[PDB]
Amino acid sequence: KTCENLADTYKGPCFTTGSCDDHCKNKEHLRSGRCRDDFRCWCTKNC
């Protein structure tokens, strides 16, 4: 029951999920962040 959208202010590949995770929480103000195989960050959010 969670939604997951692209981190918009995240330009670049995910080299460390921790960084991406941090980004989705701080910058996107969401729940967490998970990196895709395509290296882009999809931020898991609550809905």
mmCIF file of C-alpha atoms in Angstrom:
data_model
loop_
_atom_site.group_PDB
_atom_site.id
_atom_site.type_symbol
_atom_site.label_atom_id
_atom_site.label_comp_id
_atom_site.label_asym_id
_atom_site.label_seq_id
_atom_site.Cartn_x
_atom_site.Cartn_y
_atom_site.Cartn_z
ATOM 1 C CA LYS A 1 0.000 0.000 0.000
ATOM 2 C CA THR A 2 2.930 2.317 -0.562
ATOM 3 C CA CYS A 3 3.583 4.436 -3.593
ATOM 4 C CA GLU A 4 6.902 4.834 -5.268
ATOM 5 C CA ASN A 5 7.949 7.688 -7.541
ATOM 6 C CA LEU A 6 11.148 9.040 -9.065
ATOM 7 C CA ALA A 7 13.407 11.238 -7.034
ATOM 8 C CA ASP A 8 13.168 14.406 -9.022
ATOM 9 C CA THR A 9 16.083 16.327 -7.654
ATOM 10 C CA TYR A 10 18.250 13.225 -8.027
ATOM 11 C CA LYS A 11 20.194 13.536 -11.227
ATOM 12 C CA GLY A 12 22.661 10.808 -11.759
ATOM 13 C CA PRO A 13 23.082 7.101 -11.084
ATOM 14 C CA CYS A 14 22.785 5.401 -7.723
ATOM 15 C CA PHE A 15 26.208 4.308 -6.607
ATOM 16 C CA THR A 16 25.160 3.849 -3.047
ATOM 17 C CA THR A 17 21.612 3.028 -1.969
ATOM 18 C CA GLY A 18 22.306 4.760 1.350
ATOM 19 C CA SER A 19 22.862 8.041 -0.472
ATOM 20 C CA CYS A 20 19.711 7.507 -2.557
ATOM 21 C CA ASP A 21 17.792 6.518 0.581
ATOM 22 C CA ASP A 22 18.997 9.660 2.320
ATOM 23 C CA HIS A 23 18.037 11.727 -0.690
ATOM 24 C CA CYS A 24 14.459 10.483 -0.847
ATOM 25 C CA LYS A 25 14.040 11.134 2.871
ATOM 26 C CA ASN A 26 15.629 14.584 2.995
ATOM 27 C CA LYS A 27 15.159 16.068 -0.463
ATOM 28 C CA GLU A 28 11.996 14.355 -1.671
ATOM 29 C CA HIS A 29 10.678 14.306 1.948
ATOM 30 C CA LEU A 30 9.468 10.732 1.435
ATOM 31 C CA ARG A 31 9.721 7.416 3.284
ATOM 32 C CA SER A 32 12.775 5.773 1.683
ATOM 33 C CA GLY A 33 14.634 5.381 -1.588
ATOM 34 C CA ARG A 34 15.480 2.343 -3.630
ATOM 35 C CA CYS A 35 17.764 2.205 -6.598
ATOM 36 C CA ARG A 36 16.721 0.508 -9.807
ATOM 37 C CA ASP A 37 18.865 -1.580 -12.229
ATOM 38 C CA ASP A 38 18.710 1.463 -14.472
ATOM 39 C CA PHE A 39 20.452 3.244 -11.550
ATOM 40 C CA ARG A 40 17.631 5.694 -11.054
ATOM 41 C CA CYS A 41 16.102 6.339 -7.648
ATOM 42 C CA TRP A 42 12.571 5.412 -6.935
ATOM 43 C CA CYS A 43 11.472 6.768 -3.656
ATOM 44 C CA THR A 44 9.096 4.700 -1.662
ATOM 45 C CA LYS A 45 6.482 6.843 0.019
ATOM 46 C CA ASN A 46 3.556 6.244 2.260
ATOM 47 C CA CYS A 47 0.104 6.954 0.989
#
